[PDB]
Structure formats: C-alpha cells, structure tokens
Amino acid sequence: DPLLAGLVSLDLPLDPLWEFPRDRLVLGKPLGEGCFGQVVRAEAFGMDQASTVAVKMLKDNASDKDLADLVSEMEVMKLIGRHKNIINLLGVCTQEGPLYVIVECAAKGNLREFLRARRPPGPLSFPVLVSCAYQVARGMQYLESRKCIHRDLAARNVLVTEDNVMKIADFGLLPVKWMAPEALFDEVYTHQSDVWSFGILLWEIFTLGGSPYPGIPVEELFSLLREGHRMDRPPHCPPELYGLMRECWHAAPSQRPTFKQLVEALDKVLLAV
Numbered sequence: 001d002p003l004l005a006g007l008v009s010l011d012l013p014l015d016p017l018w019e020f021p022r023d024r025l026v027l028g029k030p031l032g033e034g035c036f037g038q039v040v041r042a043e044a045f046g047m048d049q050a051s052t053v054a055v056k057m058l059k060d061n062a063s064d065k066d067l068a069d070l071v072s073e074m075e076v077m078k079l080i081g082r083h084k085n086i087i088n089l090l091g092v093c094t095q096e097g098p099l100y101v102i103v104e105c106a107a108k109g110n111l112r113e114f115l116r117a118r119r120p121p122g123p124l125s126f127p128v129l130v131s132c133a134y135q136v137a138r139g140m141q142y143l144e145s146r147k148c149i150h151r152d153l154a155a156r157n158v159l160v161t162e163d164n165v166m167k168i169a170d171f172g173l174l175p176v177k178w179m180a181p182e183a184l185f186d187e188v189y190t191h192q193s194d195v196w197s198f199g200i201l202l203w204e205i206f207t208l209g210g211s212p213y214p215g216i217p218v219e220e221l222f223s224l225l226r227e228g229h230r231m232d233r234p235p236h237c238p239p240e241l242y243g244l245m246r247e248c249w250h251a252a253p254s255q256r257p258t259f260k261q262l263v264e265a266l267d268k269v270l271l272a273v
C-alpha cells in the first residue's frame, strides 16, 4: 500500500478549526471490536481538566483504502455540525504523528444491547422507551436538515451515554431488514427511506432489542415485502405507537411521516407520561 508503505510522514492538511494537541490526549482501552477500524477510549484535557472521549485510528495493518475511509469520515463529520443526539466530532490529530479522530464516547454501548441487558424476567418503562425513540428522531431530524441520509439506521447504530442520551453513530461515511423497499429493489435512498428504517428501529425499541422479521430468511424478505408483509405489534407497545410504525412502513414514501412529525408526535406522548 503506496501511501502507508512509502511515506515516513503523512502530510494531511492542517485544519485549525479542528486540530487537537496530542499531548492533551491520553489513550486507553479498546472499545467494541474491530470491524470498523480501531477505536479506543481516551481522556482528553481542556475539551483545564479531563473528559472521556473515543478515538479512532488506523489498525496496524491498515490499507491505503482504510486511510482514505478514515479521512473521508472525518471530513464528513466536520461538515455535519454538532447536535446532542449524534456522535459529534470533537477534534483531530493530523500533524506530526499518527492520524487520530476524536469523537464523543457513549459509555453504555449500542441501543440494542442496552435494551436486551435490561429486559424483565420498571427499568424499560413506557416513558424510557418513548424517550429513546424521541431522542433518535431528534437526531435524524437534525441529520435530515443537514442533507445527510443515513442509509443504515438501526438500534445497533444508536449509542447510549452515561446519562442515557441517545446518539446516532455511522451517519458519516444484516442491514437488509432495515431497508425500505425502494432501497431494497431500486437502490434508491432518501430521507423517507430513513423513516422506514426508523420504523424498524421503533419496533426494535418496543420489543426490547428484538430482531426484525423473526424466522424469516433474508432471501424471502424481497417477495414478502412485495406481497405487503409487515411486522405485528410488539406486546410492550400501545396501538397508537404501533400506528406510527405502520405509517413509517407505508409503501409510498410520501405517505410516511417526516422526522419533524415523528419528533412532534413522540414529544406529545412524553408530556402525557
């Protein structure tokens, strides 16, 4: 791999808006596993005193394509801007050392595992669940306003902080069960296909980390969706929230709610409870 094998130093351009001093960073233990590169917990000073963050870097066997992908993800996160319910870029280290991309840490892991660990034989009351759904819709509303189509919205892609704040990951760049029909069949992706995926995520939330379309092989999902198959109401789900899911899975993208409406609708349920 030319660039990584050939250069003693990697002369990425200095962006002063984002560059973070390496000596104010303390690298710690690895985070998750290793399918999306190498990510570690770290402490960052003066983001005065410390705070916990997550740091992505190249695995020691990275290819030039891994380098390009890390850089591109970095660049995309710079343009998207900050919001409470997404994993935010906090800084980069590009000058005179290894490439480090510093983002927000979410101590409790992804939403699917958070929910499943806390299943009852309470903790996952109706208000907690609606709050999860609400927070994710707010993040998606933000992303949509920044013209960012996620394309892989799922509970495994939503991370949970120490304070139970939902944060969407992988906004900057088997998934088939989260894909809208127009994306499944015609590889078309729009904000309204993210809304479909959000419907699946909603079902995920109210089955407390359940797996979508249980018992069904991915190969048959094509025709099943074509024949108009839809998942049924989760036991932990009032008919009015199920109505929301079903609307998100409208065959016609224009007849699905927008994220603005999902936020307003879920906000209402929260005030009531």
Ligand SMILES: *CCC(=O)Nc1ccc(CN2C(=O)N(c3cc(OC)cc(OC)c3)Cc3cnc(Nc4ccc(N5CCN(C)CC5)cc4)nc32)cc1
Residues within 6 Å of the ligand: 031, 032, 033, 034, 035, 036, 039, 054, 056, 073, 074, 087, 101, 103, 104, 105, 106, 107, 108, 109, 110, 159, 168, 169, 170, 171, 172
């Ligand atoms: C192949 C499956 C797999 O390994 N998935 C996976 C890998 C790594 C992470 C960790 N991340 C993460 O990648 N973050 C991130 C980086 C980044 O780079 C620019 C961009 C992002 O979105 C745009 C996100 C962020 C992040 C924030 N917090 C956490 N916290 C975390 C805490 C605990 C855990 N656990 C996982 C599993 N188990 C059993 C216990 C605890 C994971 C993550 N992580 C990341 C996530 C998934």
